[PDB]
Structure 1
Amino acid sequence: EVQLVESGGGLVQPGGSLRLSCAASGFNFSYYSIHWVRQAPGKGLEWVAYISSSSSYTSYADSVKGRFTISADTSKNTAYLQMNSLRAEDTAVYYCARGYQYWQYHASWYWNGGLDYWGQGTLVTVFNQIKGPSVFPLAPSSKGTAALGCLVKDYFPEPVTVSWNSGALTSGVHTFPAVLQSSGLYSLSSVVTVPSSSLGTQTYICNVNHKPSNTKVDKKVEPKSC
């Protein structure tokens, strides 16, 4: 019945501010420690900070010392991460996690209790600009199986979503992880393989959503005329 629930994640700009909550239930809050661990896209876990409210012990990773502040309201069974002086690379999923109250005192060559309970995470996106994508067709060739797709170029920040024919087509779709271009803008392609015979009949439309700029674009993908 132990549960940890993160909230408060969203879009924020460098030099703006954001406060994350970790709501705990199912345990005596003052007997434990609350940790913040983040994960950037495609990357490993990074421990960020902890508080043992009751002892008011706190500690921070050098990558965030002097920038982030951890605190706790015992009467609310809640811990907080106050995020200041935000930078692009603070973009990540932020998890809160439970450890022992006196974990540092216990830490030794033979003992490490670890972080037992975890929330499911809250997303923090640092952006300087907002920019919706342009969508171009990846047109099928004249070749059993044909490949087509669409190119989703020049957006910021992440993420974008892509479906095909309003979601009716899912079989054989591959939507690639976005890459950051030299321009500082994201780009990705979504592709699908279908039957060669189906090209003359079946209409293929990619549906691209970009919530940060509040844009939806539907783009038909058909053979190029020669």
Structure 2
Amino acid sequence: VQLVESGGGLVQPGGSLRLSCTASGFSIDSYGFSWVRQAPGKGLEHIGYLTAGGRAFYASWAKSRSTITRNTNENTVTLKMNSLRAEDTAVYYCAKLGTGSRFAIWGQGTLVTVSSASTKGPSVFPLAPSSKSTSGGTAALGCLVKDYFPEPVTVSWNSGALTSGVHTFPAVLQSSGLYSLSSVVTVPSSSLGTQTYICNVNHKPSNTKVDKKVEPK
């Protein structure tokens, strides 16, 4: 059994989202299903619910803008929301929540970003180790992953061979409307002359991967 959201991506301010939730392994009309979402740094939020019988109930905050329907032919339940706000940027899930039953199931979720910015791969700048970013026998270095859109990027170091001491920070939304984050790692200072440090940045929304070698000084 599987739920799969589709229809995610970019929406201009004041536009509409149209999301589909496709069931696998059962018929979409044998149970009622919810649409839930989570904006960045906010708690989970219930949008609306389509009963097994096919009736749509909306949380009051969402009722005026939202429409939930079902297509038994395509085995989907659909969510539409209009007049999208910046606060509507969120990961959206379909789910049978299982508050009282043993049967619960969630989709993997799909990101909807409400913005006028357009897709852009990241610029990856070195955060170089130096005499200044060395204290005792520990050196700090990293990569500044700047000016990408939309979320997310993934960062590894030396193709995943280096994970101890790695900190990849949450993205921040800059005033430009583009995202930015740093990934850092602390290593022995004594390795800086021998070991190569490469951050691997993947930005699936733009089909861009950047490998940045971070050299001392």
TM-score by length of 2: 0.81
Which of residues 180, 186, 211 in structure 1 aligns to 2:179? 186
Say whether 1:161 aligns with 2:159. no
Q: Distance in 2 between matches of 1:72 and 1:51?
A: 8
TM-superposed deviation, 1:203: 1.4
Farther-moved stretch of structure 1 (157-166 vs 26-35): 26-35
Q: Distance in 1 between matches of 2:27 and 2:174?
A: 48
| Cα separation, partners in 2 of 1:119 and 1:166, compared to 1, 3 Å | same
Contact 1:12 1:124 in 2 (8 A): no
Which of residues 125, 128, 132 in structure 2 aligns to 1:136? 125
Report how many aligned residue pairs link the two structures.
211
1:170-212 Cα distance to aligned partner (Å, 9 max, x none) = 2321101111223333211100111111101111122222233
Instruction: Report SS of the residue matched to 2:106.
Output: coil
Q: Distance in 1 between matches of 2:153 and 2:193?
A: 29
Instruction: Report SS of the residue matched to 1:158.
Output: coil
Say whether 1:120 aligns with 2:110. no
> Which is higher, the Rg of structure 1 or of structure 2?
1
For 1:51, the equivalent position in structure 2 comes to: 50
1:41-70 Cα distance to aligned partner (Å, 9 max, x none) = 33211000111252x422223443333210
Structure 2 gaps, min length 5? none
Farther-moved stretch of structure 1 (10-19 vs 132-141): 10-19
Structure 1 gaps, min length 5? 101-111
Contact 1:16 1:85 in 2 (8 A): yes
Q: Distance in 2 between matches of 1:115 and 1:50?
A: 18
Contact 1:33 1:99 in 2 (8 A): no
1:115-168 Cα distance to aligned partner (Å, 9 max, x none) = 951213321232321233222211113232211101112222211121222333
| Cα separation, partners in 2 of 1:98 and 1:53, compared to 1, 3 Å | same
Superposition map of 1:91-102 within 5 A: 91-98=89-96
Say whether 1:34 aligns with 2:33. yes
Q: Distance in 1 between matches of 2:27 and 2:178?
A: 46
| Cα separation, partners in 2 of 1:86 and 1:115, compared to 1, 3 Å | farther
Farther-moved stretch of structure 1 (20-29 vs 163-172): 20-29
TM-superposed deviation, 1:15: 4.7
Say whether 1:197 aligns with 2:190. yes
| Cα separation, partners in 2 of 1:179 and 1:29, compared to 1, 3 Å | closer
For 2:211, the equivalent position in structure 1 comes to: 218
Q: Distance in 2 between matches of 1:31 and 1:197?
A: 63
Instruction: Report SS of the residue matched to 1:197.
Output: helix
Q: Distance in 1 between matches of 2:73 and 2:212?
A: 52
